[PDB]
Amino acid sequence: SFSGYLKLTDNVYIKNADIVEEAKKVKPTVVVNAANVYLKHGGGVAGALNKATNNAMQVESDDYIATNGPLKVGGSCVLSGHNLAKHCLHVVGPNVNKGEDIQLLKSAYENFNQHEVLLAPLLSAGIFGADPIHSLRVCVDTVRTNVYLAVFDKNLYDKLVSSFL
Ligand SMILES: O=C(O)Cn1ccc(Br)cc1=O
């Protein structure tokens, strides 16, 4: 199971970890991907998860987009977790760098409530441009299911823990 996590609330846990390495170790039922609406897994968490699947996540995602069209910002889809998890929940948080609406971050986190337990990154953090402290606050105030947050950057992990209200 999940180990070495710091408990933030009744249902939110956090660890300084590479989510790919965490997924390979725990083999969770659900790993959350920081997806974009096109499921183009180029960089950040998406690029790293996709590379760990030997591009199988991207091939599967391109078939999903060909059939269904793009996701909405704030939306999600459930696809295979390949060698990382039973399922991958591709969640689209708003990308501030692309001028997307930051109020959609709460809608993005609501997707986590459809899964009892998840391994996840902070939505809209990193290359998505949002304030990670604000993302963690929205996470704790929105997600009611068991979420295990993997924060890649040590300095950010330390700041998130020390500033947590
Ligand atoms: O650490 C993360 O999980 C995401 N991330 C990565 C690197 C930096 Br710097 C900021 C940030 O939000």
UniProtKB/Swiss-Prot annotation:
Name the record gives this protein: Papain-like protease nsp3
Query: Where in the cell does this protein reside?
Result: Host endoplasmic reticulum membrane
Subunit info? May form homohexamers. Interacts with N protein.
Function recorded in the entry: Responsible for the cleavages located at the N-terminus of the replicase polyprotein. Participates together with nsp4 in the assembly of virally-induced cytoplasmic double-membrane vesicles necessary for viral replication. Antagonizes innate immune induction of type I interferon by blocking the phosphorylation, dimerization and subsequent nuclear translocation of host IRF3. Also prevents host NF-kappa-B signaling. In addition, PL-PRO possesses a deubiquitinating/deISGylating activity and processes both 'Lys-48'- and 'Lys-63'-linked polyubiquitin chains from cellular substrates.
Q: What is the effect of changing T29A?
A: In strain: Mu/B.1.621
To which species is this protein native? Answer: Severe acute respiratory syndrome coronavirus 2 (2019-nCoV)
Top-rank taxon: Viruses
- Domain Macro intervals: 1-165
Per UniProt, activity regulation is:
Inhibited in vitro by GRL-0617.
Catalyzed reactions:
Thiol-dependent hydrolysis of ester, thioester, amide, peptide and isopeptide bonds formed by the C-terminal Gly of ubiquitin (a 76-residue protein attached to proteins as an intracellular targeting signal)
| This protein's encoding gene | rep
Membrane association type: Multi-pass membrane protein
